[PDB]
């Protein structure tokens, strides 16, 4: 996988507090580039990356039109879902959608995606064939039947093989300075005594892009998988990410431990010691 484009929609009902909220975000790789929020004073598809700003008003109007229409449709989907699960109109529920395309270094489609969740649980997904569906439950089977009847998969396929890949390629070119630049992690090991007998070694990775990274501690060359505390990769707020991995070690055994760092921005994996 060289690059991806993904759109994420969340539709959230809130009975008694107006119509369900609809929020959409678009990403290329780990870079957000657009958003829409139906609760905004003036809802529009709005830029979130500099390289998208150059798109003309027909782009922005068209995306806004789409997001408004999408909000209406997902409000209706929330109503339908209530019926499919025999649920009360008094509770709050959420539909999420993810879709997009992955392309190789040559820009050809590697694979397409279109998945839905209801209340945080898988609902229905387009299969890798971009032709058939996997329904999670008997409610989603009803949708599957309707979508098989309407040849919905063919529509997604046409988008995923066509416009998705074409627009992704455009974005990758317009944003080439950043979207096509890996920033390797800045790495170091810190040492924190806990007692006379043990200390924590923490291996840091900072300022990296994209988010994908592997940090592993070895003791005498053996992966310490079960004994390593690994925090979730976290955004720094400047486009880059941070992560650490820690192990508790016997005092005076520090040199038996090595931190190993793999990242796409590194020509070779790194080995660090305290």
């Amino acid at each position: 996988g060289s690059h991806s484009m993904r759109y994420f929609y969340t539709a959230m009902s809130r009975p008694g507090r107006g119509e369900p909220r609809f929020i959409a975000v678009g990403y290329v790789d780990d870079t957000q580039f657009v958003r829409f929020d139906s609760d905004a004073a003036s809802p529009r598809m709005a830029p979130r990356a500099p390289w998208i700003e150059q798109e003309g008003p027909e782009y922005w109007d068209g995306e806004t039109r789409n997001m408004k229409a999408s909000a209406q449709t997902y409000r209706e989907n929330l109503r339908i879902a209530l019926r499919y699960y025999n649920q009360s109109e008094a509770g709050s529920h959420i539909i999420q959608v993810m879709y997009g395309c992955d392309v190789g270094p040559d820009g050809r489609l590697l694979r397409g995606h279109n998945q839905y969740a209801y209340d945080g649980k898988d609902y229905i997904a387009l299969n890798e064939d971009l032709s058939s569906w996997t329904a999670a439950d008997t409610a989603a089977q009803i949708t599957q039947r309707k979508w098989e009847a309407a040849r919905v998969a063919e529509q997604l396929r046409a988008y995923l093989e066509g416009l998705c890949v074409e627009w992704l390629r455009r974005y990758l070119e317009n944003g080439k300075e950043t979207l096509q630049r890996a920033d390797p992690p800045k790495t170091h090991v810190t040492h924190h005594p806990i007692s006379d007998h043990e200390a924590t070694l923490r291996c840091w990775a900072l300022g990296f892009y994209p988010a994908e990274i592997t940090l592993t501690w070895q003791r005498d060359g053996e992966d310490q998988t079960q004994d390593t505390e690994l925090v979730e990769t976290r955004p720094a707020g400047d486009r880059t990410f941070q992560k650490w991995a820690a192990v508790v070690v016997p005092s005076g055994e520090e040199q038996r431990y090595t931190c190993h760092v793999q990242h796409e921005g590194l020509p070779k994996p790194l080995t660090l010691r305290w």
């Binding site: 994420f8 969340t10 990403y27 958003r35 979130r48 925090v231």
Partner: protein, 99 residues
């Protein structure tokens, strides 16, 4: 079936007392999406706090970054306070400059 937020509180750059920086509170792994997040300076709510646009992970759980400019010192204490349906009371996570 609901999922409680993971919380990390940290700075954009390594902290250096008296040098301006950004204080982050990353909340993740939660469901449903409504969440209340405050950043605190010496127990008090910081007013100027922004957050990222609602997004979610492959497992459908949501994530948000809350953040504000700050100039850390030796004695000033920072924290992130989070409330969510899954929590009986707000959770407070103190900023530790080494984590």
């Amino acid at each position: 079936i609901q999922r409680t937020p993971k919380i990390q509180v940290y700075s954009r750059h390594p902290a250096e007392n008296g040098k301006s920086n950004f204080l982050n509170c990353y909340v993740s792994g939660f469901h449903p999406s409504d969440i209340e997040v405050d950043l605190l300076k010496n127990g008090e709510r910081i007013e100027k706090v922004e957050h990222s646009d609602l997004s979610f992970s492959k497992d459908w759980s949501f994530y948000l970054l809350y953040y504000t400019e700050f100039t850390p010192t030796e004695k000033d204490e920072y924290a992130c306070r989070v409330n969510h349906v899954t929590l009986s009371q707000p959770k407070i996570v103190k900023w530790d400059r080494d984590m």
